[PDB]
Coordinates of C-alpha atoms (C1' of nucleotides) in Angstrom, one line a residue:
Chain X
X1 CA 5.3 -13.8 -35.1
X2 CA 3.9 -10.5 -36.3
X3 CA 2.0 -7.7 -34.0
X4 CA 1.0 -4.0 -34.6
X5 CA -0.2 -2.9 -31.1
X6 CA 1.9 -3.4 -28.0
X7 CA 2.3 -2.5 -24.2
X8 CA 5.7 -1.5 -23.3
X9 CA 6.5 -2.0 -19.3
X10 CA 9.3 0.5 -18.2
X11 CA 10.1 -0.7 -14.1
X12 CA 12.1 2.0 -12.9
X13 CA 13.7 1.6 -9.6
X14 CA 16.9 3.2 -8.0
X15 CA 18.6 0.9 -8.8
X16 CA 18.4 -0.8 -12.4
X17 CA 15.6 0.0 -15.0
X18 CA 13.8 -2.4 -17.0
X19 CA 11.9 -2.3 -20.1
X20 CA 9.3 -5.4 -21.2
X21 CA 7.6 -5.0 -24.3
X22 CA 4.6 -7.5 -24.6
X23 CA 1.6 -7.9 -26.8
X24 CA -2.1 -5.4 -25.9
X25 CA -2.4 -8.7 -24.0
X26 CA 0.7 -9.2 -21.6
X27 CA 2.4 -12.1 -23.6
X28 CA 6.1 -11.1 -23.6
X29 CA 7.7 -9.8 -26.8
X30 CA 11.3 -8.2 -26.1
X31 CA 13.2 -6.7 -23.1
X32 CA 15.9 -5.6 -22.1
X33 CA 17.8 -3.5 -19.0
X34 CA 20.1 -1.7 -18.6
X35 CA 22.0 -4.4 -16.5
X36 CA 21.5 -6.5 -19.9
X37 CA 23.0 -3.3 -21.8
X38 CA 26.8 -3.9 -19.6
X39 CA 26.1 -1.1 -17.0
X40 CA 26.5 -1.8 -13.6
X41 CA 26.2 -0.5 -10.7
X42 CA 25.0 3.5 -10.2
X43 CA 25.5 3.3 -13.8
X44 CA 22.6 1.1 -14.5
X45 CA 20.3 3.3 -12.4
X46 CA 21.2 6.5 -14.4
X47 CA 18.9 8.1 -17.0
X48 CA 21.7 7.7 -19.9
X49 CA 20.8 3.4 -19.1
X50 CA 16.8 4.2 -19.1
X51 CA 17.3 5.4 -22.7
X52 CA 19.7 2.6 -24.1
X53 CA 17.7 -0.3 -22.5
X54 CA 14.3 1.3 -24.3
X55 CA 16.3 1.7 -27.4
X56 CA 17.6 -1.7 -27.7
X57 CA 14.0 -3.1 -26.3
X58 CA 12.7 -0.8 -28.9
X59 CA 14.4 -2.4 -32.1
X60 CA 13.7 -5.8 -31.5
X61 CA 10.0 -5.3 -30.6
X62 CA 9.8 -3.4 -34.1
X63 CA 11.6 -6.1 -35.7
X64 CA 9.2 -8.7 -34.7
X65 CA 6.5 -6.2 -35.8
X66 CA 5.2 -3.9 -34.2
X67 CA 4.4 -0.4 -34.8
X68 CA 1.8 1.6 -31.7
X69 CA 2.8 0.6 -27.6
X70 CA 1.2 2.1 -24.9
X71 CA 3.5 2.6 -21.9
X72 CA 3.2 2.1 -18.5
X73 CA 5.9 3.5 -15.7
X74 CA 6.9 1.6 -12.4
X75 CA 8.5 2.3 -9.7
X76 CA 10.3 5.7 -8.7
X77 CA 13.4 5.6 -10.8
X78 CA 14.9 8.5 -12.4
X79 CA 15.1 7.3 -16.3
X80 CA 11.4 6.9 -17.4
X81 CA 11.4 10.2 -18.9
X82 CA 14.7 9.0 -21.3
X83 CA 13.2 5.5 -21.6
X84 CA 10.3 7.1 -23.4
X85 CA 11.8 9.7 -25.2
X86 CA 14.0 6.3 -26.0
X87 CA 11.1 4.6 -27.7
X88 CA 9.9 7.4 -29.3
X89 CA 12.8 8.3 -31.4
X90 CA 13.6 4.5 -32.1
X91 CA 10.4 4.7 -33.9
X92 CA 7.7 3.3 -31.8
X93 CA 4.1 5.5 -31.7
X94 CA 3.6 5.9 -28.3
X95 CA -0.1 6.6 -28.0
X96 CA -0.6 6.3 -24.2
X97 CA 1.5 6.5 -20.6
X98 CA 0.2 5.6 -17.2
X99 CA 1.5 5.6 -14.2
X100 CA 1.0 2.0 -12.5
X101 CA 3.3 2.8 -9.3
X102 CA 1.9 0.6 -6.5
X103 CA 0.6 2.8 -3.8
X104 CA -0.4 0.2 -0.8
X105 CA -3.6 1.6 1.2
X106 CA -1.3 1.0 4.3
X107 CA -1.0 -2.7 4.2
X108 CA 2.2 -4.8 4.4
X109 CA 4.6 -2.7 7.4
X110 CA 7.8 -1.6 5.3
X111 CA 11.3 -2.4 6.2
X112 CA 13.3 -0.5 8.7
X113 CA 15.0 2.7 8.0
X114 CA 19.0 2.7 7.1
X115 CA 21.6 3.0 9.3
X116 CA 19.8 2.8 13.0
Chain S
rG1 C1' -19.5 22.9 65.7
rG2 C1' -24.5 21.0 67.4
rG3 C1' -30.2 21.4 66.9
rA4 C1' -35.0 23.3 64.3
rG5 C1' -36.2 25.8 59.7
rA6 C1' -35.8 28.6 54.8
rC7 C1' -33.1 29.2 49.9
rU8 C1' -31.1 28.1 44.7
rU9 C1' -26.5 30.2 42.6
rG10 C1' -22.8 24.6 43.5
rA11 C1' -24.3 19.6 42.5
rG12 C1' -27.7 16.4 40.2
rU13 C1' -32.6 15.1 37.6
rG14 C1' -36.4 16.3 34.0
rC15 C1' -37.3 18.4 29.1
rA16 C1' -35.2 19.9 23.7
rG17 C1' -31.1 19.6 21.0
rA18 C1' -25.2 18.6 19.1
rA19 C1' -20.7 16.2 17.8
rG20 C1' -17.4 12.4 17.9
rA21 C1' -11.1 7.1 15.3
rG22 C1' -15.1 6.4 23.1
rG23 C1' -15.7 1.0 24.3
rA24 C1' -17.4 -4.1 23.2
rG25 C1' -19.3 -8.1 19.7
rA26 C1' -20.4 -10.1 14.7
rG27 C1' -19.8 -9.3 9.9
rU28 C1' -17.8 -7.2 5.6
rG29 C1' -14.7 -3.9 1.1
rG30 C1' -10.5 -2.3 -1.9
rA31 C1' -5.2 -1.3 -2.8
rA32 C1' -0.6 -3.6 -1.8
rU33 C1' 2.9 -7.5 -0.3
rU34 C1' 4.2 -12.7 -0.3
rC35 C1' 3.2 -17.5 -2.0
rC36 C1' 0.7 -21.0 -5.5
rA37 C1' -1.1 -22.3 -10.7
rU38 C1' -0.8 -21.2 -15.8
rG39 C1' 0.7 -18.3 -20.4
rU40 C1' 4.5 -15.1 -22.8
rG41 C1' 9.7 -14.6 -22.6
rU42 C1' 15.2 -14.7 -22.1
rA43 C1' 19.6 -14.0 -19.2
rG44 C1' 19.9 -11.6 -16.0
rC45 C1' 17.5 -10.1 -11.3
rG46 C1' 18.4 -8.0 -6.6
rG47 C1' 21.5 -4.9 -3.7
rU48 C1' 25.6 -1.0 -2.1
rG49 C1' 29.5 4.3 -0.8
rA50 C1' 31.6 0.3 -3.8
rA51 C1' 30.7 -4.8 -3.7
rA52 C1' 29.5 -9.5 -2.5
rU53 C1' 26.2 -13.3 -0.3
rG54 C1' 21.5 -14.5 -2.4
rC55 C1' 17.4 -15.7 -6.5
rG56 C1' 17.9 -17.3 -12.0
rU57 C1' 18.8 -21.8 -18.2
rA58 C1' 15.6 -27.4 -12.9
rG59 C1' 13.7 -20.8 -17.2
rA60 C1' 14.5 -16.3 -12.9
rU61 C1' 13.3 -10.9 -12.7
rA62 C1' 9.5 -8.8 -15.8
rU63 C1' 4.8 -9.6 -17.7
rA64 C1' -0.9 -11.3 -18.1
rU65 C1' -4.9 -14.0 -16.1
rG66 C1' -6.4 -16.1 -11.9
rG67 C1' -6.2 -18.7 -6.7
rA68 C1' -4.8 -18.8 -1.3
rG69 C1' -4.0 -16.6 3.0
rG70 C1' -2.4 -13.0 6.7
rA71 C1' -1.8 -8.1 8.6
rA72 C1' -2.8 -2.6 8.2
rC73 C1' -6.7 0.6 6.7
rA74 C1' -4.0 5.2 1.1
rC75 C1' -6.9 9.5 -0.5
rC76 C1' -10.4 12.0 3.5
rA77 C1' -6.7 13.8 7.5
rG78 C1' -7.0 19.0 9.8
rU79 C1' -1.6 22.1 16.9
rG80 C1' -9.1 18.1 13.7
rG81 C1' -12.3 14.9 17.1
rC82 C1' -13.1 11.5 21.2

RNA sequence: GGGAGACUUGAGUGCAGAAGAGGAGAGUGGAAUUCCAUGUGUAGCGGUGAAAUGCGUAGAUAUAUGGAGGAACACCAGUGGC
């Protein structure tokens, strides 16, 4: 019901981005996207959408309570440096960023390249 | 060319060293994907040139902790090696 320290999840693809804010521990808290925000198609993937999804993610989160996040980007998309500057100016303390961008150690065979 | 010898340079052995993803067998490690279980959480997610099919209020995507199992071995890595 009330929380001062948070993580704030900012997936990032090429598509949409997404922002999750959750407790220190994971348990959701707010989100939003920018496919939640009305855009749609290229739209949603453009930096512009990064920094209105973070804002609106952003109020919420504070108005539940909460006051430090430390953030964590995913995926390649082009709007994680809006989404944070996003948080920041909403009001959120950012103390921390990481970059959690799955990097397999060769693994699982990706798909097939486009138009072949 | 044949026959009887001689020789050590080719060829091989001995001796002393060097490198290596060479092969075969048995194990084993971590990232990641997917699925499964459980929290949080809410309306999208995913995808395209643009869309739609599709997945999602029977609670999805995300997110956190785990579990299962399979395949390939990031960085090293280099007209590098074998």
């Amino acid at each position: 019901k009330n929380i001062e320290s948070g993580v704030a999840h900012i997936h990032s693809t090429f598509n949409n981005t997404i922002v999750m804010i959750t407790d220190t521990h994971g348990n959701a808290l707010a989100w939003s996207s920018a496919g939640s925000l009305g855009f749609k198609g290229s739209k949603k993937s453009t930096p512009f959408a990064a920094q209105m999804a973070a804002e609106a993610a952003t109020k919420v989160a504070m108005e539940h309570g909460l006051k430090t996040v430390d953030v964590t980007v995913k995926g390649p998309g082009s709007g994680r440096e809006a989404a944070i500057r996003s948080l920041q100016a909403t009001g959120l303390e950012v103390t921390a960023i990481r970059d959690v961008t799955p990097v397999p150690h060769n693994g699982c065979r990706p798909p097939k390249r486009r138009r072949v």
